Design a protein around this nucleic acid. Structure first.
Lengths: 46, 271
RNA sequence: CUUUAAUGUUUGAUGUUCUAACGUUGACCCGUAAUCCGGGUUGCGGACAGUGUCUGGUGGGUAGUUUGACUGGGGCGGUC
RNA sequence: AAUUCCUUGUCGGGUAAGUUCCGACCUGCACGAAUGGCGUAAUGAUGGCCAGGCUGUCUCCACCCGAGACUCAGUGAAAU
RNA sequence: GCUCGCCGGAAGACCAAGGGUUCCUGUCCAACGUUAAUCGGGGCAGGGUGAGUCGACCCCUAAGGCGAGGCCGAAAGGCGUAGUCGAUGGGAAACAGGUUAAUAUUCCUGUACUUGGUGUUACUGCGAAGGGGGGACGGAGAAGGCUAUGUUGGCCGGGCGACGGUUGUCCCGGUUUAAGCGUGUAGGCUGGUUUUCCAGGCAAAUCCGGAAAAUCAAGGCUGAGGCGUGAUGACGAGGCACUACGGUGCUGAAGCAACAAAUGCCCUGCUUCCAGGAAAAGCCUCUAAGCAUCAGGUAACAUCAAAUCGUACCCCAAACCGACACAGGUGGUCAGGUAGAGAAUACCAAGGCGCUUGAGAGAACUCGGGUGAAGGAACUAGGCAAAAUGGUGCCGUAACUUCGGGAGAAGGCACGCUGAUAUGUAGGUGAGGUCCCUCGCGGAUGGAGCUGAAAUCAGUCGAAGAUACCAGCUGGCUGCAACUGUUUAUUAAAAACACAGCACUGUGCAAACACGAAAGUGGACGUAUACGGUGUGACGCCUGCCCGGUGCCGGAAGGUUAAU
RNA sequence: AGGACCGAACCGACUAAUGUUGAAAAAUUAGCGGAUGACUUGUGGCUGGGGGUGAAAGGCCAAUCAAACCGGGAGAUAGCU
RNA sequence: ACUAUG
RNA sequence: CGCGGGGUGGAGCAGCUGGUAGCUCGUCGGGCUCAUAACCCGAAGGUCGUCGGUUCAAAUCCGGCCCCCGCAACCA
């Protein structure tokens, strides 16, 4: 069967990457929330 | 001429196509083409605002001249072309100063025909001139509404506004709907009917032929579930509503013109 | 008092004109290398249209809810 | 009758025998004209019925070829 | 190592994506590996990825994104102009041979090409953010020309056979060579050249567009392949020798012709059809502002430059997505032989595998296959399943029909091998030689050689000649839906949805309607022969009565009635 | 010529058997339907939860759908176990 | 205002 | 059965709120016509299904019995 994850680095990084988050208000709140949690990976980048 | 194609497959059985031998075969005139990319009925929010549109064949936009604003200078019809954006065929014209433009092809107009705009022009089909300078009685097309804006009324295939009255600044038009209507009389109108009037006699003959013109399927309310449409549910085939749009407004009867600023210009609503 | 008249009078609302608010998804000019926007010139509408506050009508388009108990199981019937 | 409760209605056809099928009748419990009526060549992994061919489907199972089953060696689960 | 078996339009080779050291060498076997393991995609150490031309980067744009000013919005924000991003598309250039344990169009050997910079010399109207050209575009179909490629002959080098025959019309192996540069062919497109005038291309234009005369008909553009050169080279079956028996060294034969032939190239061609088939830059050309001894432009020669990042390995998979070393999923490219219509199927080549538990036994029962006396649907809810039918050519073919269909209806017949017609025909191809010529990649006749159906007649073997694999069961009545389609990913494929067609109704354009507190966008760069909604559902014959009820439409006299 | 016919790739999913702590959280074997189109497929893009999209099955929206998932109100409330 | 049948 | 409705001159209907039985057709008698039908005139006829209660009094209010319709008889 074809399964749901069909990986593609361009699409990963445009959905979820660092500059994607730093666009919207809401995505900056996300980065703050995980800096605050203390989180080794912020985002999905390299 | 209309042509009952012979029934060799079940989808050819009912097709009736509108062959015109007089049209151009070969690529259309290049300077007047644009890109024109499709919407699938969706707006700047991505949402379908208009159901049933989608797909079909790619199409270039022919820049037609609806204004006809180039005056006193005679023009010869080079050829009649197919135009996919449009029920009417169009005509390439060459002016006496070597400009080309497309225009709508009126009924009875072939290669070699002189056609002229502005106020001097003779009252013969093809020719555009302000409606003060046309005889009452006359049959026109591609009619403006504000002076200088360009033709809006009577552009489809086989259509014609018909001038019924002068009265000062304004004139009165029996539009094709059956709606008498004042337009102020500096507004231009080409003369004639519009061509290709056999266009209504065509029959597409199969589903796919509708898809080629960019027209998706249409699902009846009574098929759907109650959450999707007012016509909703039923065990079996019920109705028992009064017919309504998907957004719950009565169809079959209910009038929907509220537009008070344009009311003064309407002599009489359609029959 | 009844009926009625012109003297004057305060508001009325029913037309018809007008232009100066307002409209213009008419045309041209400029910012400008720009089908946005703004400004100008000129037409066409014109106190209408349209927006606010108040108000009647409509309104399963949407929402929140209700839709009793007894009962030789429940429902129907019957009762309170 | 994708509609008929009574109903395996009655009559005819087909079978040695037909609650199904086909043709009729009309007593339509409770068909019916674009929530369409009656017809229809072609089309259908569509529903029902009949016939020829073919057969281990069956009378009624028999034998054979491989893979597991069983024994030996090594590894080694699970529901409860 | 020697046999055996399996894949071979893949179970082979090569890209992209995705992974990221899994690659190669040494070493170790605790754990991992559904068993052991000296082996490993496991542990440890070391090694390996070499570019002006391949790809990204870069120049250009699509859908789309972001968006200075701007418009709109309690706030957050929303939409959008100028712009600026965004490939899956457009834009310069490389081939052959060699070599490592592991890279190679990247290294080495040869032979090339591309675009920039600076300098010299000769000649000279250069120059946009503007004008024009070009780039620049669909589907189907046909058939002519080729090549990749293959088969056969000839040429060269080996062999003369473990068992009867095998010095011959016998056997085995080889017969390969690129980009580039030169020539310009089958074919395809097109009248050509010079002058004069002109409300068009936002201004100017010598460019494009337009109108006019005058003059020769053959000039131009495009273009596969072939031949020439590249190549006196490279490769090359082997042979002559040294070897840690892994390989290292030295030399090197022939290297032609014919036929068949693509789904590849001419071909972005040609013919045809309606549903009428991106954009922008590079590129070519025109001028305006500007500058004229300059600057810049054109050609020739020199000289310098072409950075950076990717480059290992897996890729129909043990390395990707599925928790697994998982019978699943995954875009593109290549396409040998014999049979065959074929990319089906069988057997094979190149190449690659034997699927990481085995060894015996030969019970019941289960799984997957084979055969079956007599009968032949009696089975069963139901012929479910199985059996059967199956090819090519020829004969022949009913009701009904929308005249197309039904129809491959049904149902028959022939089919192997050998020979003759003809030591191989009809046909296809076409050399040598003669003849001609605006003398070449030319034309005429000419037919050697090569290839080669189909038929008839005569013979001959078998139980059976479409012998295997492959490959329709057929007919009759009837319901529903006209038809091809669509549907419940994971128990429903249907009579459900859709459909062409029909009808009603709304909508006069700042349209109705829809998404949005709004700006705005779709509708539509459409305009009533158009667009939205609702119902019915090809076609044929038709479509009756009711306006009391409920909606909708119109009507305004009177009644009742809100804020004020 | 054709939403024409037969039939590989490719798309699908009608019947049966197996499997049902599977080889597989939907497959395998044998047959089956489409196969120049209302076809199929790659890369990128748009539509967002009472919202989308829907040839309409309440289908699909990351193995979840008559209202997704993650966090919060939150120790919701539970005359019931 | 009249009308049907034998 | 559970619920509800209806039995009225010969036929179809009205009257059901206790003191009063009507409407159209049919029957009977008279006319008109040669005769019949139509047409004109005049007259009758109803135990109000049946039994029993209540009231001074019952078609009428109330109960039982009989016939006749309609609706319901469901979830497993």
């Amino acid at each position: 069967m074809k399964r749901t994850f069909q990986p593609s680095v361009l699409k990963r990084n445009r959905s979820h990457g660092f500059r994607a988050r730093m666009a919207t208000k809401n995505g900056r709140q996300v980065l703050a929330r995980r800096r605050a949690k203390g989180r080794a990976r912020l985002t999905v980048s390299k | 001429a209309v042509v009952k194609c012979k029934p060799t497959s079940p989808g050819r059985r009912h097709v009736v196509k509108v062959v015109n031998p007089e049209l151009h075969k070969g690529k259309p005139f290049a300077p007047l083409l644009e890109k024109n990319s499709k919407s699938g009925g969706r707006n700047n929010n991505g949402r379908i605002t208009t159901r049933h549109i989608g797909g079909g064949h790619k199409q270039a936009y022919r820049i037609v001249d609806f204004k006809r604003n180039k005056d006193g200078i005679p023009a010869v019809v080079e050829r009649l072309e197919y135009d996919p954006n449009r029920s009417a065929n169009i005509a390439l014209v060459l002016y006496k100063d070597g400009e080309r433009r497309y225009i709508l092809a009126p009924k009875g107009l072939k290669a070699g025909d002189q056609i002229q705009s502005g106020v001097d022009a003779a009252i013969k089909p093809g020719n555009t001139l302000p409606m003060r300078n046309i005889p009452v009685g006359s049959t026109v097309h591609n009619v403006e509404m504000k002076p200088g804006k360009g033709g809006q009324l009577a552009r489809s295939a086989g259509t014609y506004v018909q001038i019924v009255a002068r009265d000062g600044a304004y004139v009165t038009l029996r539009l094709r709907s059956g709606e008498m209507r004042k337009v102020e009389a500096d507004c231009r109108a080409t003369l004639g009917e519009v061509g290709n009037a056999e266009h209504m006699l065509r029959v597409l003959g199969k589903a796919g032929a509708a898809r080629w013109r960019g027209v998706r399927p249409t699902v009846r309310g009574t098929a759907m579930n109650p959450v999707d449409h007012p016509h909703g549910g039923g065990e079996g085939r019920n109705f028992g509503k009064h017919p309504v749009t998907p957004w719950g407004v009565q169809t079959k009867g209910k009038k929907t013109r509220s537009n008070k600023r344009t009311d003064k210009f309407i002599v009489r609503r359609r029959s």
